[PDB]
Amino acid sequence: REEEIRELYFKYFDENKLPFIQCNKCGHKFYYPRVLCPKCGSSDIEVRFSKGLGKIFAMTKVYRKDGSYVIYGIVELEEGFRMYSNIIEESQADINRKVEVIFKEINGKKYPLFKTVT
Amino acid sequence: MREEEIRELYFKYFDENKLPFIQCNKCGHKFYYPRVLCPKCGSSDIEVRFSKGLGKIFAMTKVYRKDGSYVIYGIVELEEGFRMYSNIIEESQADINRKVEVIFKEINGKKYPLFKTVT
Ligand SMILES: [Zn+2]
Ligand SMILES: [Zn+2]
C-alpha cells in the first residue's frame, strides 16, 4: 500500500533517482505517491523515473533571519507532471527559469531539490 | 501562512469534527491537501473553507487486513467539488458513486477524517 510506496521513494532518492507514478489505465502522471490514480482512480499504476529536468512553475520566498531566503516552489518536469520542492538559487530564480534536480542529504537521508541552471 | 501552520490548523479542525479544504482566489481551484501555493495556478492567494462533509465514492479498492479480512480505501468526491483519499466504513455496502459522509476517528491522540456510507 501507500506506506510502502513512500518508503520506496526514499530508496530511489538514495540512488539519486527522481521517481514518479504513471497510471497504466488513463496515462496520468503524478509525483505524490498514492495507490490509486488521483485522476481515474485505477490501482494499475507503476513507478517511473524522471530525467529531473524542468522549470519553475510557481515560487515564493521565505526569508530567514540573516536576510537570506529559501525558495518554496512548484517545479514542472518535462515528463509532464508538477511537484512541490525547495529551489536552490544559483542563477536568478524566476517563473519559467529552467531547473534540474539535485539530491541533498537532510538529517541523514537524501531528498530531491531543484537548482536553477543556465 | 506557512505550510506547517496550515497543517496545524487542519489538525485543530479535525478535532472540532470539521473537514477543511482550500480554495484558490485566483483560479477557483479547490483542493484538500494543504499547500501554500495553489497546485493548479501557483497562486499564494488561497483561503481555508469548510466542507459539509457530504460526498460520493469516486473510486475504491479493497485492502487486505492481517486478521484475514479487508478494509475499503478510496477516493471520495465532496459535493464542494474536490477529491480526497480516505478509508471508507461500510454502514451499507460500498460501491462506486455511493454517497458517503465524513466521520472522525482518533489515532495516537489526534483525530483524522474518514468516511462512512450512508443509509
Ligand atoms: Zn489513471
Ligand atoms: Zn489557483
Author numbering:
A (entry chain B): 2 to 119
B (entry chain A): 1 to 119
Reproduce, without paraphrasing, sentences from the article in which this PDB structure was first reported.
Here, we present the X‐ray structure of S. solfataricus Trf solved to a resolution of 1.65 Å. Trf is composed of an N‐terminal rubredoxin‐like domain containing a bound zinc ion and a C‐terminal oligosaccharide/oligonucleotide binding fold domain. The Trf structure reveals putative mRNA binding sites in both domains. Surprisingly, the Trf protein is structurally but not sequentially very similar to proteins linked to acyl‐CoA utilization—for example, the Sso2064 protein from S. solfataricus—as well as to scaffold proteins found in the acetoacetyl‐CoA thiolase/high‐mobility group‐CoA synthase complex of the archaeon Methanothermococcus thermolithotrophicus and in a steroid side‐chain‐cleaving aldolase complex from the bacterium Thermomonospora curvata. This suggests that members of the DUF35 protein family are able to act as scaffolding and binding proteins in a wide variety of biological processes.
The S. solfataricus protein Sso2509 is a translation recovery factor (Trf) that interacts with aIF2 and is responsible for the release of aIF2 from bound mRNAs, thereby enabling translation re‐initiation. It is a member of the domain of unknown function 35 (DUF35) protein family and is conserved in Sulfolobales as well as in other archaea. aIF2 has a second function: It protects leaderless mRNAs against degradation by binding to their 5′‐ends.
